[PDB]
């Protein structure tokens, strides 16, 4: 029965170790994602939460009719 149907204890042991490593890395990544999202919401210096402003390519720099502008 052990030779035909059952997995070895060593195989299960190392499979469990691999599973634990993968989910531990995923959990640390999730916590870092939450911290990064909170920081970029708070400060707004990063690539996320960049709400649009007015583009400066629409300004006319030619001389106008009145010098005071």
């Amino acid at each position: 029965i052990a030779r035909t149907f059952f997995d070895a204890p060593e195989k299960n042991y190392e499979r469990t170790m691999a599973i634990l490593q993968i989910e531990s890395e995923k959990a640390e990544l999730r916590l870092k994602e939450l911290e990064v999202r909170r920081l970029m919401r708070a400060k707004g210096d990063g690539p996320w939460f960049q709400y649009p402003t007015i583009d400066k390519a629409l300004i006319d720099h030619s001389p106008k009719a009145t010098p005071d502008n």
Binding site: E25, K26, L29, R30, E33, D45, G46, P47
Partner: protein, 57 residues
């Protein structure tokens, strides 16, 4: 000996040689804020997929 200008002569754009220097800051603008750092580097695949609950990819 004065000659009256013709049509469009007074409306020309001319050049002026002057001694006063060009104002480097006529608008009295202060220092602009520093822009955000840009994005750089190659796009690696996402680590362990979506990482959304039980989904492996």
């Amino acid at each position: 000996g004065w000659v009256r200008p013709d049509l469009g002569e007074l409306s020309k754009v001319t050049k002026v040689k002057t001694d006063r220097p060009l104002p480097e800051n006529p608008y009295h603008s202060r220092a602009r804020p520093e822009p955000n750092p840009e994005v750089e580097g190659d796009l690696k695949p996402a680590r362990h997929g979506s990482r959304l609950f039980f989904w492996t990819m």
